[PDB]
PDB file of C-alpha atoms and ligand atoms in Angstrom:
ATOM      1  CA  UNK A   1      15.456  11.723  -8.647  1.00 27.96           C
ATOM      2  CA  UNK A   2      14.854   7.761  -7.862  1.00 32.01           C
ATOM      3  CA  UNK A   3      16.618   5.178  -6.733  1.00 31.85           C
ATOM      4  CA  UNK A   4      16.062   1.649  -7.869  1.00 31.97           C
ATOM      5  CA  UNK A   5      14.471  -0.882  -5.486  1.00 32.97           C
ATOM      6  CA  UNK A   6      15.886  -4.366  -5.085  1.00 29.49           C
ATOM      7  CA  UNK A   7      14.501  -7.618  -3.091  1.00 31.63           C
ATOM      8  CA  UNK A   8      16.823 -10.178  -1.724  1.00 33.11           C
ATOM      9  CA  UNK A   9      16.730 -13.864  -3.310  1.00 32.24           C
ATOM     10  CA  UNK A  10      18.729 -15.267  -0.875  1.00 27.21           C
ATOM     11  CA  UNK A  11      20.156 -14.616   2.423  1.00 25.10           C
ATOM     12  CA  UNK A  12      23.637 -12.952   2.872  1.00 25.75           C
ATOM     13  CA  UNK A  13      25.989 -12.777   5.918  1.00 27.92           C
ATOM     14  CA  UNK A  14      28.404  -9.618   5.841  1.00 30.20           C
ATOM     15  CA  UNK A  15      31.738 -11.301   5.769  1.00 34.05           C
ATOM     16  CA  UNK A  16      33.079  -7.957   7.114  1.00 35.80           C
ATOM     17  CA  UNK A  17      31.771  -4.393   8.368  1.00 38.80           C
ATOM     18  CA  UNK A  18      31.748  -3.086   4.666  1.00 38.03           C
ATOM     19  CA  UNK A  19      29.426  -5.470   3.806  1.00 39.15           C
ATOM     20  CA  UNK A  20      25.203  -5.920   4.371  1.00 40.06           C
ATOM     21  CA  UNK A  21      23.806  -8.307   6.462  1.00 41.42           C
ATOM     22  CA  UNK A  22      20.196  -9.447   5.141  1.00 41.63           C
ATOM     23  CA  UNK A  23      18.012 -12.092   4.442  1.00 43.28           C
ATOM     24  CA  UNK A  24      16.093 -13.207   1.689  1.00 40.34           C
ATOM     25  CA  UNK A  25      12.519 -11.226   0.911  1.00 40.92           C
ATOM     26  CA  UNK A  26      14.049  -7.731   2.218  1.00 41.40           C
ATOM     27  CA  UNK A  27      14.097  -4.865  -0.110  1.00 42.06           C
ATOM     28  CA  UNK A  28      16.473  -2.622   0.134  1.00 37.45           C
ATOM     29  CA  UNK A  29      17.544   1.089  -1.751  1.00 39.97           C
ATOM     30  CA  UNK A  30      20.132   0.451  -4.725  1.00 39.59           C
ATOM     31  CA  UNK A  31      22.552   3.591  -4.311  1.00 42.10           C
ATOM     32  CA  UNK A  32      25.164   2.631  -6.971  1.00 38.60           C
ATOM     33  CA  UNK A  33      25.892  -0.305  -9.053  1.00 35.75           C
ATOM     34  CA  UNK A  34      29.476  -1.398  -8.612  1.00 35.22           C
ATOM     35  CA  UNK A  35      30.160   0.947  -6.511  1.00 29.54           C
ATOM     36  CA  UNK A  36      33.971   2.137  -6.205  1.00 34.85           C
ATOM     37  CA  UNK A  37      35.537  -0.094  -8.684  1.00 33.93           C
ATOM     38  CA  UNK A  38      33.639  -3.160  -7.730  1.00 30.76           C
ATOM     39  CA  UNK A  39      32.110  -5.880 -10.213  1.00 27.36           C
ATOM     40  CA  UNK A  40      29.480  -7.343  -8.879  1.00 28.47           C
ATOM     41  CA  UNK A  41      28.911  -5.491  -5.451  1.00 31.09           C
ATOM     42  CA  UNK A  42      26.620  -3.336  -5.360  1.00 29.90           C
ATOM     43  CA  UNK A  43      26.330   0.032  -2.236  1.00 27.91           C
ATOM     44  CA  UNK A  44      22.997  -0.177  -1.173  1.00 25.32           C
ATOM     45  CA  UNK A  45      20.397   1.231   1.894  1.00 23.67           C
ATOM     46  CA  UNK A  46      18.474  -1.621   4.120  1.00 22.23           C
ATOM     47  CA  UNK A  47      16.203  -0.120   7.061  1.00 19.79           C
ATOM     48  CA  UNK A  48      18.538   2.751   7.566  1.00 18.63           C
ATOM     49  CA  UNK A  49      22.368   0.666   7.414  1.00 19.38           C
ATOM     50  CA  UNK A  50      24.447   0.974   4.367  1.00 18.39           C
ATOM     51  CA  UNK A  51      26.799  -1.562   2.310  1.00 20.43           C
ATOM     52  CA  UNK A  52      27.687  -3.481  -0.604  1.00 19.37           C
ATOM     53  CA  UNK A  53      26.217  -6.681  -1.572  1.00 18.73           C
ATOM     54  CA  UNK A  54      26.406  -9.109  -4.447  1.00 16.64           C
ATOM     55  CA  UNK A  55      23.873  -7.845  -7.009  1.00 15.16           C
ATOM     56  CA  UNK A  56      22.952 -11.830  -7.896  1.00 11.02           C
ATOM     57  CA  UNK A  57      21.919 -12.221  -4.774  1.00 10.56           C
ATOM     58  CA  UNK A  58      18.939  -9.315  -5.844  1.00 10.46           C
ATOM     59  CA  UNK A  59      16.544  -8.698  -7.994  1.00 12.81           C
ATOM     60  CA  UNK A  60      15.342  -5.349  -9.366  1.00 13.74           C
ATOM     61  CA  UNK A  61      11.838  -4.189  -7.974  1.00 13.49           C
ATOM     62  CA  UNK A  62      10.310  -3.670 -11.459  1.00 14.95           C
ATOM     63  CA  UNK A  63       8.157  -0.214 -11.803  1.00 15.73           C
ATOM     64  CA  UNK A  64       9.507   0.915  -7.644  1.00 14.54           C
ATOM     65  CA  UNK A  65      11.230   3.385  -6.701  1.00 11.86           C
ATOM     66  CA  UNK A  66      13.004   5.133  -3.791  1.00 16.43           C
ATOM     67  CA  UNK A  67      13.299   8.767  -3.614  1.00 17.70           C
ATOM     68  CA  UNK A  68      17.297   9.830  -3.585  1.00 15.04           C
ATOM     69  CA  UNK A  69      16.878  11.564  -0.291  1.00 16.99           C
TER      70      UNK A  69
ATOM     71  CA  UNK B   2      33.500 -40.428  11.581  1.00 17.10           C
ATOM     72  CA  UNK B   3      31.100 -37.531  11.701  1.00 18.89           C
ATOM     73  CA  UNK B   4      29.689 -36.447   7.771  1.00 20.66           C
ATOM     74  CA  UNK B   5      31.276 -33.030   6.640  1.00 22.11           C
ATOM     75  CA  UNK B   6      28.580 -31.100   4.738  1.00 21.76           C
ATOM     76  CA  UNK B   7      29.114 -27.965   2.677  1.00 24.67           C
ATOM     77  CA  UNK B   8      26.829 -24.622   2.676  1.00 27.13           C
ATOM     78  CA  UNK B   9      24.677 -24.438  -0.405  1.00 30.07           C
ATOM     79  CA  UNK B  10      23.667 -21.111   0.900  1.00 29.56           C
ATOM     80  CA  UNK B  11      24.064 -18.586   3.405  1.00 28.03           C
ATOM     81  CA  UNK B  12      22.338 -18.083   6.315  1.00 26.34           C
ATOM     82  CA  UNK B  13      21.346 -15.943   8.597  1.00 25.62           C
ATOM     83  CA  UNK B  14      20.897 -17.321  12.261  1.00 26.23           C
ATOM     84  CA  UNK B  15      17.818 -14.773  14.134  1.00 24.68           C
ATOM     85  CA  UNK B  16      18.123 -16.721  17.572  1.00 26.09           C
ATOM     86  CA  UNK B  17      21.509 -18.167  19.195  1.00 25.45           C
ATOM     87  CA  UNK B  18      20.591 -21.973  18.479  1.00 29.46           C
ATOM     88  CA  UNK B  19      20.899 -21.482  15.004  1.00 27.46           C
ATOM     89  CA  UNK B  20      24.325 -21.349  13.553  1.00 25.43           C
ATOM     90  CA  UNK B  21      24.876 -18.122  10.890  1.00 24.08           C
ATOM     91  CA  UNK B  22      27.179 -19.525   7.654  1.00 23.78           C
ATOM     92  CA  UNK B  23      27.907 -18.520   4.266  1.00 24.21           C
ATOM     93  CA  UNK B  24      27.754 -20.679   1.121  1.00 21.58           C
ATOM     94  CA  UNK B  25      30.571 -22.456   0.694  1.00 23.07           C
ATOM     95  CA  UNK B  26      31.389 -23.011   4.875  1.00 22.22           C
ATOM     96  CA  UNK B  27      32.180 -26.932   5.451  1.00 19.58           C
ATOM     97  CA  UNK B  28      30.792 -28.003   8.809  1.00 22.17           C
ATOM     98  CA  UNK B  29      30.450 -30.949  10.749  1.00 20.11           C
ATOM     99  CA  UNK B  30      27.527 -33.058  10.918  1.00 20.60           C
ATOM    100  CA  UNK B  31      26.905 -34.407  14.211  1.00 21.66           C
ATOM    101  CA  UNK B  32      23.517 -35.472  14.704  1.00 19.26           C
ATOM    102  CA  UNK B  33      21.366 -35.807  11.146  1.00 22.56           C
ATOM    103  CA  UNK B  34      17.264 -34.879  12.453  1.00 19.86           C
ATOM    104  CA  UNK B  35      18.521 -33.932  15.752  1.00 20.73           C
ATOM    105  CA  UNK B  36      16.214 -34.272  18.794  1.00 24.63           C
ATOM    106  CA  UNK B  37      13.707 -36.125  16.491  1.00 19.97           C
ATOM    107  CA  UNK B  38      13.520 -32.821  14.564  1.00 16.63           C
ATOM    108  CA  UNK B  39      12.654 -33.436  11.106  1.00 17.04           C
ATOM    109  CA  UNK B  40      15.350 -31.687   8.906  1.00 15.99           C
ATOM    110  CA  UNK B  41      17.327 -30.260  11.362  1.00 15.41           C
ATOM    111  CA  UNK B  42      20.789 -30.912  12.278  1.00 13.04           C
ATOM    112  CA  UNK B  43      22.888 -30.343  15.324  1.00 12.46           C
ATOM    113  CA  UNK B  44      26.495 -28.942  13.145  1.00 13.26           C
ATOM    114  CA  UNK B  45      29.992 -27.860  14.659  1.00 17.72           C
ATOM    115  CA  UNK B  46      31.237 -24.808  12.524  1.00 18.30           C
ATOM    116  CA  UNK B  47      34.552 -22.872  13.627  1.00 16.85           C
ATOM    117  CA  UNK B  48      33.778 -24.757  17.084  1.00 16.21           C
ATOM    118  CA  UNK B  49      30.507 -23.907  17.575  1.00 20.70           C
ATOM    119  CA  UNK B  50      27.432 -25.900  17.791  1.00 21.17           C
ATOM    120  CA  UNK B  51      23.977 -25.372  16.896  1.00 23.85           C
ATOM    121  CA  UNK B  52      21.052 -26.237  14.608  1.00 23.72           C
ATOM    122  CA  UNK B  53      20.858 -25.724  10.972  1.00 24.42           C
ATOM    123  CA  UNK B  54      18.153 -26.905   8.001  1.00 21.37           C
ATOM    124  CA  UNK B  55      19.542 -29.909   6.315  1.00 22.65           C
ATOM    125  CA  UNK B  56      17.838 -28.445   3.651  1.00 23.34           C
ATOM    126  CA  UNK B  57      21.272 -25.715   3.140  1.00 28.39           C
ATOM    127  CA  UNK B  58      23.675 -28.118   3.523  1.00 28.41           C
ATOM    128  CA  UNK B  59      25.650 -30.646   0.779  1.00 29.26           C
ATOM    129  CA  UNK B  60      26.709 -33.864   2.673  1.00 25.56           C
ATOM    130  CA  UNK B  61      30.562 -34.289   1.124  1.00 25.22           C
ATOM    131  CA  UNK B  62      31.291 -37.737  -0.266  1.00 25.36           C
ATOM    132  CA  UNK B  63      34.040 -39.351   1.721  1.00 27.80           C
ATOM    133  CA  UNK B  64      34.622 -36.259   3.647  1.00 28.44           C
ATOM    134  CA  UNK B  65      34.938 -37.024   7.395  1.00 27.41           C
ATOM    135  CA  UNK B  66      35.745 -34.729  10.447  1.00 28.75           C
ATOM    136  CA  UNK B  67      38.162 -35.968  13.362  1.00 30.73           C
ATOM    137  CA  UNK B  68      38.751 -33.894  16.385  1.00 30.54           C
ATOM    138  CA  UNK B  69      42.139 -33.407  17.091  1.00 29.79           C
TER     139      UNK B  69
HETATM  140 MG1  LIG C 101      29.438 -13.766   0.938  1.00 28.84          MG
END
């Protein structure tokens, strides 16, 4: 049904293709928690581009919600 | 000598002045308040120049940079 929401803390420049490129205040869709084998790195949904990013580098948007489509 | 400072952070760069780093990236320092800019730097990363916050960086203690 939902997808968590997540705001960035910090800034974060994709060190490859793989990887979101974002800065700090943007919110973005959580699609899976350590995705694919992954600690830490989470597959996520920013203004239409998909990636991983560090989950520390979030925080979860208590009580919000994105729907899964 | 030109100061070596490390990234505290990373950053993204939204005009071409500004350099983009990640945390961790060592840089030379080459002009502390650049321009008479108040906590901006003029840094050489990778070979490229441009302006970043002082305010991200870590100056490194006895860490100098030497072009070749
Ligand atoms: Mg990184």
């Amino acid at each position: 049904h939902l997808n968590v929401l997540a705001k960035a803390l910090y800034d974060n420049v994709a060190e490859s293709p793989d990887e979101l490129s974002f800065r700090k205040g943007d919110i973005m869709t959580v699609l899976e928690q350590d995705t694919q084998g992954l600690d830490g790195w989470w597959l996520c949904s920013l203004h239409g581009r998909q990636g991983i990013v560090p989950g520390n580098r979030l925080k979860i948007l208590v009580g919000m919600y994105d729907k899964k489509p």
